[PDB]
Amino acid sequence: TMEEDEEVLYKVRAKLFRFDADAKEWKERGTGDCKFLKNKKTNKVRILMRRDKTLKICANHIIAPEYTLKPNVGSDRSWVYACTADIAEGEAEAFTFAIRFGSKENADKFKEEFEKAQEINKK
Amino acid sequence: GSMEGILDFSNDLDIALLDQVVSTFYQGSGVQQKQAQEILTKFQDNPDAWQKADQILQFSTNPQSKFIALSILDKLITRKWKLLPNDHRIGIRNFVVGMIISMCQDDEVFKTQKNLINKSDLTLVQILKQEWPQNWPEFIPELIGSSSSSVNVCENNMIVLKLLSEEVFDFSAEQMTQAKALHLKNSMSKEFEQIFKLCFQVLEQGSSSSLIVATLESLLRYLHWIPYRYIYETNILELLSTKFMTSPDTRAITLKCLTEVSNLKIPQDNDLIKRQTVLFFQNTLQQIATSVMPVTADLKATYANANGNDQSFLQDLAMFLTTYLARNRALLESDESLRELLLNAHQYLIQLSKIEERELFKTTLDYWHNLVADLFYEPLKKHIYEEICSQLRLVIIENMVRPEEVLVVENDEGEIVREFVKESDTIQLYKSEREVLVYLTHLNVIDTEEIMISKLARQIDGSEWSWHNINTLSWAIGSISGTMSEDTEKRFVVTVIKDLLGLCEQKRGKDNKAVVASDIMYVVGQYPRFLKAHWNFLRTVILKLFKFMHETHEGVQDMACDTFIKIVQKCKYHFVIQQPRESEPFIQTIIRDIQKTTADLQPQQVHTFYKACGIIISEERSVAERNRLLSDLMQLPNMAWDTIVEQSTANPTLLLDSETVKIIANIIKTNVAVCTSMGADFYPQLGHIYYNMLQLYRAVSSMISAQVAAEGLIATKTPKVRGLRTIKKEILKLVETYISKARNLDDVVKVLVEPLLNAVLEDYMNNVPDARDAEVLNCMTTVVEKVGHMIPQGVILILQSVFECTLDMINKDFTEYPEHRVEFYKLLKVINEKSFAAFLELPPAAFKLFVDAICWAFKHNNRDVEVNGLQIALDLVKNIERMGNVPFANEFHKNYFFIFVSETFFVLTDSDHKSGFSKQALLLMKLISLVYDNKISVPLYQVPQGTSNQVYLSQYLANMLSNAFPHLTSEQIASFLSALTKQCKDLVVFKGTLRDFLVQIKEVGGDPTDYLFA
Amino acid sequence: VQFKLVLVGDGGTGKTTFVKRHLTGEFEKKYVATLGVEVHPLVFHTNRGPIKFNVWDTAGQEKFGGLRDGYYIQAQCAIIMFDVTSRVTYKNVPNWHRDLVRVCENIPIVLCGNKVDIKDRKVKAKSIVFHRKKNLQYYDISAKSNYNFEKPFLWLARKLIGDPNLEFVAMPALAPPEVVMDPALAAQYEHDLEVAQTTALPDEDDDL
Ligand SMILES: Nc1nc2c(ncn2[C@@H]2O[C@H](COP(=O)(O)OP(=O)(O)NP(=O)(O)O)[C@@H](O)[C@H]2O)c(=O)[nH]1
């Protein structure tokens, strides 16, 4: 499972989108628990997210300090950001992710935790 | 690469290269597989590819290549056979028959290439469907004669006969004409006497498995249609029920044959046939008990282990026992020597009912419904099944599934959460279980209560405590509501509720307290009759619901509000009156503490609470007291409404505050919630806000258009504009809700209508398409439905404001603006129904668009649009006919009669609107009946003068169908229209002639005499 | 350990959308008719190792039928799809079944009633009985709401492996790499990003 050497810092239900720049539309990638996993050995925090029933990974990348969360034009409960190395589908690809939550409260709590985890990886 | 060379037909076909393209497709991957896919499809679709099938069957070393060759012949035989010369048809017949015999006599090919031989048999049957027996009358005699020369040929002849029986009796309704299916049915029925000889001989003497299995598989098809004497007047029932049940390699197919025999309605007066029907059931059950499993076996564990074909056998055994017993169990109920057989069979079903398999449980439950319903009415039968029914009570009580009302469910991680999607399959299964358990309760109330009272005792003392066990028991208790009498039910529910009230405040935990809360709420909501006669209980119940509205779990809060409505819908009388030992009507107590009670509820649950209070208040029929109760209830929303109206008449920006939008929308949502439950009684409250609400509607509308101008069309996606449009949608929803239930239509027309149309019509018309709310159309439909006959000028205005601009939104494709399409044609339907005069007031160009809109709805695959479009066309024709012989009616038929006839024929015959065939047939029949009843008093042409519309219609349709279907002979079209005309008052036969036409346009050479079937 | 799966049903019943949901997690709202067949590999992680389904997504519309029953050759399992909002698609289930089992005499087959998320349901649960005599497994499913969307493959995997206790398990989560953004295009990570930032997310009235 490759998760026993990690600690869960944050958990929240969410829906994850990837941007298909060719078709200029958002495409779903998964719905499930979004977790912030801090490795107990190296202390670097990653995002790990699995789809509900199949438990397949739809997000797997370090919360790099160079990432920034931006709002989406049609949502007050979503965040948009670029990702240069996600390995959910195999080889490290670059993606422009969007993640939506059940409420603006969950979306603000996520941004608080997302930035808290960024300060961890900055050492 | 160069795989495309096979698509060049000028040079010889490279058989080897073909075999590589095929191997690349089936065995390859990626691009080369997709490249080979498009090449093989093009190769197969070439009209001349069938001439290359001869050499593919000879020179190819790939079975899949020969398969595709046969598919190319299959398309030829099915669609273009009668166009070939007589020498090609014989030539193809011979080498199909020759290849089949060739593959059978090679014993190794017979084993290794089963797929290729089966494809060849099906292809041969396609030739039979074209040539037999009028051009091959010796087929069955030759087939029987060749069966003795080789055992492989004999086994394959059973596959051919099986396939032939399927194509003629099972799959001919939608693939042949009525006359052709009747022809091939009579042909097989004529020769079946000699087919059964071969079948029975092969079954009597029997080689080894393979040939028997193929023979029994073919018999399973014969049992659909063959006469009863072949089954009961021979020994074949003794063979199926004994010999072929012992060997497991024939047991499955034999069990399916016996199920088919069991489904026949045998002559219920023949003591001999009843004796044989009892006999094969007695033999079958003996073979199962001695060779498969004894009656005491744990079939639940056998099915879960899933060894071999155990699951399919238990499925087929369930199907056999239920089919037989649902039809013939009376044959066993009287004779005392047949009692053990009758009960061992039902005991097998009891054991089958313990298997964990939803679909298999539904099958056995369907039979239990059949049984217990019969025991409910038929005298002297209950006592036979007393022990069966007592076991069945245990099974159903322990396997109850979750009903609608229970909103709490255990999650994939073991947490008790709130269900997010409704399980329609689970809901239906609960209702089927309730229906059986209700019958079982009537059959023995004492046994049912003891099981439920004993299980509850072992839930109360933790001996059997379990979420599953407390849920199934509680759902079973609530489901039998109404089966006991009062006093008897009084005794029962006081007991149950108390222990539930106990267990609720005994178990601590976020999950446990929520599981018991839902069980309490479900049980109590199912017994309103008890709650009516016990106010002390009802009041205690209602206050516990309020206590659950303060819990953390949203599901417990939601169910409390739903249970509140459910109880109140039945017990509302006990809230309006001054109960004994009470200071005031309990509604007055609820209304006062309505802020404290709903302090922790989310908005949409607060609105459900207000709707529940609206149900109570509507029980009061004193107009003064009810209008005051209505005012008391709406205090908080009206107080907040006055504030956002006092400080909003000045400072228009307040509306733009996001928090204010959420507050405004929740106020209107509360007004919708109350108006839903009160209907016409909501008028005092509506008038208190109506004129201000419509100004708010105007204020919101301007802000929306300002945003789209300042930000662009993307503004309609923002949370701000989405919040403002919600105020418009909720305002329209409130007005629509009231007018749909209003009784004082005079007040609606004189007070409500004129300010409504002024506030919404030009706003909808002059907004950009993406800013238009389809809820405007939905609201106007209710206006035209309920008061359309009183506002003929309002209906005209409604048309002008929405008709042309909405039609332009939805006439470029079939998918843009989906909610506008549905509401658009709903509006045109009611206008054309209750106010047709408004279309007479349309300019002739706007009436041309109306006809275009109706036919545009024909070609929709959306059923919500397609059904309304065919209904409008049907009502329009009736509206035109009622006018009589006036210029508008005569102008209509001149300009539009043949547009409707041809546009209806187009969707009838394009193979893309099969879902609306019945309404299309009904419309075409009405149109044809107009001409042949001389209801059109003008010529439909601009043909020598004096000719009848009957004659021109036939010349027109014959010419229309000739150009659209050029492969039809003139006599096919002539006979079809002749029959279609004679039958334009007999819809069943009219639809049969149409379906016969749809078969004939798919092939070449259809017999025109087929249309004389009726 | 791979198995060929053919997927058949009337056009518009959701066959392609159902597969795309399993491949990428997306929900395709457009209807783009399949032409012949499209083969997609689909891997599931179980407690008995990975299992791979070579999913042959065939065409439902007759005019695009392609090789038609030729796609079924050497298939080892199958899914029959119909639409619970279209009675015609359920009346054709016996036809798709007939063509299928004439080529594949003894394979596991799931019958799926799709689009159960739509309120106006036309093929009610009470009339869906065709699978009983034919030994098919049946599931109400919705590619939109994901209701029972994993159960067809879970049932087929149990029947193909021969282990009724087979379960889907969480695929291992390899350690993700640490990578800094590219300052050569970080000045351009504001065009394709501001585009995505101003393209509205779909279905904003959902719970997620
Ligand atoms: N509401 C809803 N729509 C669905 C669902 N599944 C698929 N659809 C929709 O049905 C339409 C048909 O899409 P598609 O998957 O291509 O169906 P298909 O059976 O593969 N068509 P074809 O056989 O011609 O290739 C799409 O618009 C899709 O969004 C569903 O579960 N719910």
Ligand SMILES: [Mg+2]
């Ligand atoms: Mg498709």
